[PDB]
Amino acid sequence: FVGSIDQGTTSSRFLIFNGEGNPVASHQIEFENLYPKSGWHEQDPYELLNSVQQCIDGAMHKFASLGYSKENIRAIGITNQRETTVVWDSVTGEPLHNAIVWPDTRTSALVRELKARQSADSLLELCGLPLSTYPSSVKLLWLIQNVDAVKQAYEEGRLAFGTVDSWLIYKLNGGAQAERPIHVTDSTNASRTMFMNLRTLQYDDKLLGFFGIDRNKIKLPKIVPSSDPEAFGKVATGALAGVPIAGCLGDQSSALVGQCGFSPGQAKNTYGTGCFLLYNVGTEPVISKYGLLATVAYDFGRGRKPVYALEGSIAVAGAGITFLMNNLGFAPKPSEINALAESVLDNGGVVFVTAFSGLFAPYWIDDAKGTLFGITQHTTKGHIARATLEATCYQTRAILDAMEKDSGHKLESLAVDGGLSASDLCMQTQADISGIPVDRPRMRETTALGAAIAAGLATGVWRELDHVKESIAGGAREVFYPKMDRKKAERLFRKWEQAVEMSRGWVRE
Amino acid sequence: GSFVGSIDQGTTSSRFLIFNGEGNPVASHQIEFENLYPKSGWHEQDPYELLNSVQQCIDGAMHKFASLGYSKENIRAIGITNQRETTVVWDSVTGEPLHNAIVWPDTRTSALVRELKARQSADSLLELCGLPLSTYPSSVKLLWLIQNVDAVKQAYEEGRLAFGTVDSWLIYKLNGGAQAERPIHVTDSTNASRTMFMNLRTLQYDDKLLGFFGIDRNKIKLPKIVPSSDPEAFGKVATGALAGVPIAGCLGDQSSALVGQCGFSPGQAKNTYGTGCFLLYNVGTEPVISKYGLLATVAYDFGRGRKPVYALEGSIAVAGAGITFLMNNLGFAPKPSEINALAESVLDNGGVVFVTAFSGLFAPYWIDDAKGTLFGITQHTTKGHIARATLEATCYQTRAILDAMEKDSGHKLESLAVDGGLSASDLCMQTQADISGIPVDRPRMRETTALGAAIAAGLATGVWRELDHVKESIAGGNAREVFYPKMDRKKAERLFRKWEQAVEMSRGWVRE
């Protein structure tokens, strides 16, 4: 009845859902990347554009294998990797260069000079973001500045910029060769560029004046809401041709919607090499005083007000496990690392400050390295494994507490997906440390369900939010509850904060 | 023939060895015996399990001695070296113990010590006896026994109580105990310098010291302090395989190790490795009270008209314990050989530093609130970095103690001899020479501690005439034996610099 496009960094895919949130079709084909110098990442635009409509042609032929068709489906939404900068010609509808994916770090030079300018300190309170290498403001500028090929398209009047969501929507309505050429972005992606006032949801002339981008010389994408039938046009050519595009959400905002994290204080944590945390702060935007990112969680328009969020990341969660295995020869497999941590009753007094490349929000300690405290002849691999897992939960709490202070709303729930969210012990400890229930849903493609939720509300599939989350019932092991005395959990977190402070100042030059 | 026998009564084992004139042993026997741990921190021994193990070693050893065609006629005399500070109480008329021995690492005196410190005349003890109040000295053990054992308190009151370090106990019995012509209740200056009952410059007892502990020299028979090399004060073995063989040497074990290395010049030091380290530093005829927490004791009292020699002492709690930790606790490798190999497998510590303060840090740092702390871990850290850091920790703590020794004494470090345990790791000691900037001497003759007692005995009986005759004879003798510095002083000083930073960043971890 509804469906979803989930294009990202490694791959595309196209799932199609029902009124209960159950995915009844999928098709996913990968694609590879370049590293043409340390810190450089690129991607020919058409590759993933073609990648995605390759997915829909197979995904939707399987779809009809049980007698369903487009006429049975109302609209489709889009969720996409963020911060990726694309550039093309007003005239052609064709790339005037290749793309700069978010991992790229060629802008470091540019960022360090931008950070010097006097009015660089006024940006954060307006776009909600720190000057960095990920934002699209600097990827685009670097090209206007450095690139030999298409500085003139800026100068001549024929250049158009877009995030991935816009490029897809562009050609999927018929490129420049269509009745109504659709060149737009949703709020959750434009919050990433550093061109948008977070309070206005509209391009700010002060932020463009900082980077020197003249709107008369460049064609930017019209910012629209994440749920709208008219504004995303329709699908140009394919099995879904003529079906309305009605959804668009950035990568990690869409996941929150799929988990139905619609209330202030609701957070989610995605584990991996590290963590990525997202915190729903409500209808009023919040600028972090702790180095966290402020973004748009979702903008369903339709009369309702936009909901914002705070963003936080941790460099080391799963890397801590790999370290104990490959670097220390504890075990040759991650499961056995949990077994070594369920080995022992407690951390034995051990604390592992996993600051391999320093520490980040909320601490911001650049002169620390990995530091292991509390070792005795009684310490064993179990204790160190247990502490390594605890390091992840302490840094999670530290950020969540920071978003509590930033936002003025206390934490109410946390949902978690990712390799180390599989550790029952790790997830139980988070509930003990955070004093709040830790949710772990079986459903996997949350990040694509959000784009479909948005398209559905635009089209009457779901009446409201309170309705979206009643429909999902259709689709220890799912929820972990605080079992430790609140006093013992404060004691653990205090030894950890103590260890962090005593880690400061290791690297002297 | 003419050989010299040596009883080495240790805290875990007893052994009896028989040395020729050039310090090489030809007969040996060793016995691990029972150590009792009745509760947390307490450590006891049956005083007869120590005598018995010694006697068994004498039987076993000279069985081997005879197989070579020798006998007692070929043994001029016998030397004794023992675990220090281990306390024994016995009835001065029956000769039978009144309580198990309390071995030196016992902790039961923590309350007695913490209170004695309060008594406010304690700051004077260090300059008289060379030691501060610890759980280790015999005084507080003897006191705990009295304050908590009616059996000894009675014998005390009745005037029939005798205390003695293990050396006194042994010589008392091997001469026949009571019930003998020429009974012997004597201790050597080295062992007597560990009780806190004796004045270090005097080499005699101090009434003010025993006034501090509530001990009167009439109600208790103290062993007679005698030279470590006396032809007649130690008497002779009465029965057994060595009946009639004179005893002429007696030295605390750590002093005997220094003598076995021929460390008689001021500035010569030695390090005995084990679970931890014991370092001794020769400082000449004048005793030197430490300002860095080191212990001042007697190095050796060889008589024959030569002034006693004193020493400074330090100890590290974690040297071999660190290797054991990496192998068993972290599964790195199952033998010290492979830990070394893993340490040589990489070029350097990779920026890793391991403050091996499992039970806090002792001299000269005196940090009680630190625990084992490992710095410098990145995703590029491998087991050889940590292995390297673990061996380096022992060397840094060694250099720390030796630099305190130089400052206290005024003598530049002239040499360092090494025996036991981690001594066998060429990279550990190569690194030690690198860090301290002096050559490191490792002899291949392993029973260095047993040798020092035989030296004392032989000097009292003419096996060696003077002390330059002794090191001449030893040299009458695979692995290397000398490690020379290889490192840029700058890099060596950077490594020690990072260590001292890590030590300082490690304090304050433990809170109560």
Author numbering:
A (entry chain A): 67 to 541, 550 to 583
B (entry chain B): 65 to 541, 549 to 583
What does the paper say about this structure?
Here, we report the first structure of glycerol kinase from the thermophilic filamentous fungus Chaetomium thermophilum (CtGK). Glycerol kinase (EC 2.7.1.30) catalyzes the transfer of phosphate moiety from ATP to glycerol to form glycerol 3-phosphate (G3P). Overall, the CtGK polypeptide chain can be divided into two distinct domains classified by Pfam as FGGY_N (residues 65–325) and FGGY_C (residues 331–583) connected by a flexible region. A similar case is found in CtGK, which forms extended dimers via the interaction between the C-terminal domains with a prominent contribution from hydrophobic residues (Phe422, Gly436, Phe389, Leu394, Thr437, Phe439, Gly440, Ile441, Thr437, Thr445, Leu438, Ile450, Trp580).
We initially determined CtGK in an apo form using ethylene glycol as a cryoprotective agent. Initial molecular replacement efforts using a conventional approach were unsuccessful, we, therefore, decided to solve the structure using a MoRDa automated structure refined pipeline. The asymmetric unit (ASU) contained two polypeptide chains. The electron density map allowed for building the residue ranges 65 (or 67 for chain B) to 583. A short loop of 8 (or 9) amino acids (542–548/9) connecting the α-helix H18 and a β-strand S18 could not be modeled due to insufficient electron density. This likely reflects the high flexibility of this loop. The physiological dimer is not contained in the ASU but completed by a symmetry-related chain forming a rather elongated assembly (A:B’ and B:A’). The dimer interaction is mostly mediated by β-strands located on the C-terminal domains. Although crystals were grown from the same condition, the collected datasets were processed in different space groups. We observed that in the absence of nucleotide, CtGK adopts open conformation, which upon nucleotide binding closes up.
